[PDB]
Design a protein around this nucleic acid. Structure first.
Ligand code: SAH
Ligand code: SAH
Ligand code: MG
Ligand code: MG
Lengths: 192, 291, 291, 180
DNA sequence: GCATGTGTTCTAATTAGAACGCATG
DNA sequence: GCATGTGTTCTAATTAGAACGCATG
């Protein structure tokens, strides 16, 4: 995906699932403060959404997947979020002749175990990249799979899993959103 | 429907079979007169592989565990004209009280079939013929049958083996095979009642037997657990060769690998009713070579 | 010695078989093309009788334990043109160090064959044809081989299956059959090497195997006690179907009565080598009807 | 077997196996005293005796079988005596046409197990009669004919031949010459 | 109204593997 | 001059058979 000149960058058409990130996308400056309809669709109870639905919702430039943050909001099994995400992702890809850049990403608030991790990487054809966001200490970490080049291009601070295992319980995102959503307006319109 | 292929443009079929079991798919296809170009089977049970190896003399390429099959593997071993699979129902069937649903335990192996089916689908702009089919139990949670249908973008037709075999076996069948909803009709060589399946000097106490599981308890019939057979005045359970005839397999099909009564039943109890798979695959004769 | 019969004066054969086992006698007789008029089998093992009835569809009349056969029985069920049998050798063979000779234990059952043979013989002045034969192991005390020969008033002809089987099996054969002493020669269909008896994708380490017994240890060859087979690079024991092909039996002949590996080996281990019995009964088709 | 007129009762010809009964038999006067070659043949061990032997030993009128009584040691299994006895009788029985009365008897000193009793009866085609003691299987009509005292198995527990044993030989005198 | 099932687990019987044996080419 | 055999026994796993379970035509 070659970069696009600045005078040819459209606004993103974002599909967001299981978690609403409109507050974050508008903030980093990809969405209009006021949209008559909107450039971002958001659904949660996806069990009953068909391919004909996401096609009727216009084409999409980005599809964003997320698991709920560490808490007691686990009403469905952990694997359920990825499988449904992969199901909709294939509904949302454009025709084989790519008119424009089409990106996707799926994030995990450390809710998937080992067995759920290796099945996630097999389906997304990529093994994840994790972010520390721990400039203060061991403070508040999320694994992301992503199409976005700069997400899987620049390597930042590493961390041992023996230390990543203990910090999972530590809960009992200004920097995180900035870290990887950032290198997307080298492809889309920047609003501010 | 799919465009008909003239008898001369037809070419041998290349099948990807997942959770192949005892190679029922291959067995049906060659007993159906279809020339099999390639049969790629994913199976991890050593006894199951032993059967498909010995009974089919190595025409089946075994590919161990389905979860180690890559996108590269599908293009290498491809192309495929048929993708068939029956996922394990240890955590889906209602016969198990401790079942863990579609998303935990063994039930999540369904998604491997979904995953590898799309790797195998012809790319857009290539309407070469392509058929698939997925099977599972009817006795599953409503949420599972719903979600399976959503991923396959299809709704199942149920066929019960009882119309063509001597046994109750109600199973769902998602797929795109020609005439899956077609009315089921028996053949002149279907062993329709239990007496047709027994050997000499054995008497059938029923005309049709309840659903056979892996455990030896589904051979005793009903809520008074009577042995289904009488021999020389004594009550007795079914024999391994008799279980085979019930399922439509060729007799002695599981006489492999020094397997005893329990082992054969575990393999037969998990398989497909042969005459039902024969029903489903029959319209494929008009799309592939025949020798 | 005995004069030939013209083809049209030949009647179907009437045979009394004692210690019938798995009906090897009936099998070889039918496989020779001999019309079998009557086959009266004394056998007391359940699954052995199961094999005979199922594989031969009730043509064999079973007459339980031999010690309950009366003088009246022999003349009712008679007349007999052939009397065959091999007594239990667990108290005669050298393979058991706790043998009890032929005067105690189960060895005394030999005399049942002697005693019922005299009943079956045609009375003096009846020059009609009559044939008998008795088999046992060579590994017996010299005193036992002597006494048996005294009662039968005959000396045994040892035949080893090694020349027609893929297995060492040396046994004595008392009798009065035509040309027992003649040199034995193989046939086209005789599977002489172990590799001719194995299944697909299995490799045999030897050309011949040591004498098959009832125990599963007889299958590990030599002092090294190694698995006679390799498949998929791993060592493995023989399979029940392979044990059958070694003995010359039809494949799946012991897939009866939900029998596992051990059960089937117990029956085959004490059996006769089919091609040896064929060699012995081959000159009989010149005295009886053929269909 | 009908009775024989007294003037044509020839002398017996006895085959005695496992016991020399010549002393016991002569007492009741069936054998001429002194060097009578064709009156009694005795064989102690028989494991090598062929049918051609007993045929060459002249025809026989009586075949007698017995086991060792309360022997301190027997070098042979108990069943061995009956089996070898049945073996020779088939050699000794004459042609189907009956030239004369042919008799046989077997005698057990209560040394056969019950497993050996039921095989003894099956082979000798009759159940034994007990003479109070010893059990005998016999072809003789007049020892399976008449009077005999009925004793029970509790008598064989505590037990664990001049007059009593010879009482089962007297009826043979009605068929052969009485030497006195 | 109530019987049924592509299985698990528990517990009881039953069964595998090899040591054992030594006369005899 | 060492190896082989129509089996038994003992021990140790490997079963076999049934209880368990309840949503649903
Ligand atoms: N991870 C895996 N990869 C491939 N096969 C697997 C697997 N896990 C389980 N299986 C196999 O999938 C099969 C499902 S039972 C279905 C058997 C088959 N439909 C037939 O006709 O017999 C079982 O045999 C099981 O051994
Ligand atoms: N008392 C008896 N009466 C009849 N058969 C008996 C018996 N005791 C043992 N047997 C049987 O005698 C057989 C001897 S093994 C010989 C088997 C036979 N020759 C064959 O070719 O297979 C055994 O099967 C045993 O079950
Ligand atoms: Mg359909
Ligand atoms: Mg001879």
């Amino acid at each position: 995906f070659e970069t696009v000149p600045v005078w040819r960058r459209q606004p993103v058409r974002v599909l967001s699932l299981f978690e609403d990130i409109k507050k974050e996308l508008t903030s980093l400056g990809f969405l209009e403060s006021g949209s008559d309809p909107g450039q971002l669709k958001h659904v949660v109870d996806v069990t009953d959404t068909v391919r004909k639905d996401v096609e009727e919702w216009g084409p999409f430039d980005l599809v964003y997947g997320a698991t709920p943050p560490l808490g007691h909001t686990c009403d469905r099994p952990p694997s359920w979020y990825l499988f449904q995400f992969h199901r909709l992702l294939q509904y949302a890809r454009p025709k084989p002749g790519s008119p424009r850049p089409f990106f996707w990403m799926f994030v995990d608030n450390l809710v998937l175990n080992k067995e759920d991790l290796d099945v996630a990487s097999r389906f997304l054809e990529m093994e994840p990249v994790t972010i520390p966001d721990v400039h203060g200490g061991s403070l508040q970490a999320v694994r992301v799979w992503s199409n976005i080049p700069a997400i899987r291009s620049r390597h930042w601070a590493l961390v041992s899993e023996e230390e990543l295992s203990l910090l999972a319980q530590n809960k009992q995102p200004t920097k995180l959103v900035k870290n990887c959503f950032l290198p997307l307006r080298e492809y889309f319109k920047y609003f501010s | 429907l799919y465009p008909a292929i003239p008898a001369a443009r037809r070419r041998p079929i290349r099948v990807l079979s997942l959770f192949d079991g005892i190679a029922t798919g291959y067995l049906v296809l060659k007993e159906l007169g279809i020339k099999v170009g390639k049969y790629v089977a994913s199976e991890v049970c050593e006894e199951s592989i032993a059967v498909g190896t010995v009974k089919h003399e190595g025409n089946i390429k075994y590919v161990n565990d389905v979860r180690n099959i890559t996108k590269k593997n599908i293009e290498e071993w491809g192309p495929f004209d048929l993708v068939i699979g029956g996922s394990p129902c240890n955590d889906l069937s209602n016969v198990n009280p401790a079942r863990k649903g579609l998303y935990e335990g063994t039930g999540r192996l369904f998604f491997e079939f979904y995953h590898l089916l799309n790797y195998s689908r012809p790319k857009e702009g290539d309407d070469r013929p392509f058929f698939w089919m997925f099977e599972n139990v009817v006795a599953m949670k409503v949420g599972d049958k719903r979600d399976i249908s959503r991923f396959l973008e299809c709704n199942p037709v149920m066929i019960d083996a009882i119309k063509v075999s001597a046994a109750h076996r109600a199973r769902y069948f998602w797929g795109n095979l020609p005439g899956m909803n077609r009315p089921v009709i028996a053949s002149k060589n279907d062993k329709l009642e239990l007496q047709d399946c027994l050997e000499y000097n054995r008497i059938a106490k029923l005309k049709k037997v309840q659903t056979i599981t892996t455990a030896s308890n589904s051979i005793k019939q009903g809520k008074n657990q009577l042995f289904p057979v009488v021999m020389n005045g004594k009550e007795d359970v079914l024999w391994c060769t008799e279980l085979e005839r019930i399922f439509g397999f060729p007799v002695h099909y599981t006489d492999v690998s020094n397997m005893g009564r329990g082992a054969r039943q575990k393999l037969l109890g998990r398989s497909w009713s042969v005459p039902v798979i024969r029903h489903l695959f029959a319209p494929l004769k008009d799309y592939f070579a025949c020798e």
